[PDB]
Amino acid sequence: NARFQQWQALLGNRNKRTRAGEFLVMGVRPISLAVEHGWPVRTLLYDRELSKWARELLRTVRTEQIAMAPDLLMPPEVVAVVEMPADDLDRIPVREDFLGVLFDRPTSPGNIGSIIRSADALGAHGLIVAGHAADVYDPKSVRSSTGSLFSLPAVRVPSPGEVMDWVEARRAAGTPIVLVGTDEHGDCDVFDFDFTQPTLLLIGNETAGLSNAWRTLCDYTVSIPMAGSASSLNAANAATAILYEAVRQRISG
């Protein structure tokens, strides 16, 4: 095996993932979402069982198709090498009902995936991973997104200044996006805020909150009421709940 070892390097460290511009995706369901949403598939790896769905995948996705022994597939029956898109902020569409999420400096890839799943499911339009972060294309992120990665554009952006240039430009085409930070001890209960406006929701780190550079640029900062001093919420759970509040207002009136 040789080109196999290039595929194995994509599981481990993100340096090699970035240079090749591609990543691993497993499961008939995730791959089909990738095909359906226009993501390129350079290679398609497959085990003797084979499902009805996996079979239909082979005779429909017209790309390089390679058989593998059960041994080497590490427990999945299909794996795809998928073309990683460019990190363009215009992949996120901005309309009058904008609802987006920024995740500030996350250390948990699992948490990124979770946010994508939740933002996809609750009708948000895009996610931004800002700053020195764990990789959107890390397998823990791909897995826990559950295929939402392909329907909900996640864009990676090292500088917070580049996010502000895009936001200000969206503002210039009449779309009054408000930045809404989130925090345990904020100035405004989450259910008192008007989520019917175009909204970019800023979600903080697991150990630090939001950076202080993001708290300054926030128009408003909202909080979910908590039972006590000792308690707080995980990033993905908290963000799910706020996104849900937004949907509720938008549906309620």
- Would you tell me which residues interact with ligand SAM (CB under 6 A)? 182-184, 186, 203-204, 206-210, 223-224, 226, 232-233, 235, 238
Residue 8 CB, shortest distance to a copy of itself, in Å, is 18
Sheet holding 199-203, edge to edge: 154-157, 126-130, 99-104, 199-203, 178-182, 220-223, 188-189
Token pair listed for 20: 């090749």
Q: Which does 11 bind (CB under 5 to 8 A by kind): a copy of itself, ligand SAM, none?
A: none
Binding string to a copy of itself for residues 180 to 219, with x set by CB under 8 A, is what? -----------x----------------------------
Residue 45 CB, shortest distance to ligand SAM, in Å, is 25
Among positions 3, 56, 188, 244, the unique one binding a copy of itself when judged by CB under 8 A: 244
What sign for the dihedral angle of Cα 145, 146, 150, 152? negative
Q: Is 13 in the site for a copy of itself (CB under 8 A)?
A: no
User: What secondary structure, in 3-state letters, does 76-145 show?
Assistant: CCEEEEEECCCCCHHHCCCCCCCEEEEEECCCCHHHHHHHHHHHHHCCCCEEEEECCCCCCCCHHHHHHH
Q: Is 253 in the site for a copy of itself (CB under 8 A)?
A: no
For residues 228 and 53, what is the distance between their CA atoms, to the nearest angstrom?
Answer: 48
Tell me if 225 is assigned to a ligand binding site: yes
| Residues forming the site for a copy of itself (CB under 8 A) | 33, 114, 117-118, 120-123, 144, 146-148, 151, 191, 224-228, 230-234, 236-238, 240-241, 244-245, 247-248, 251-252
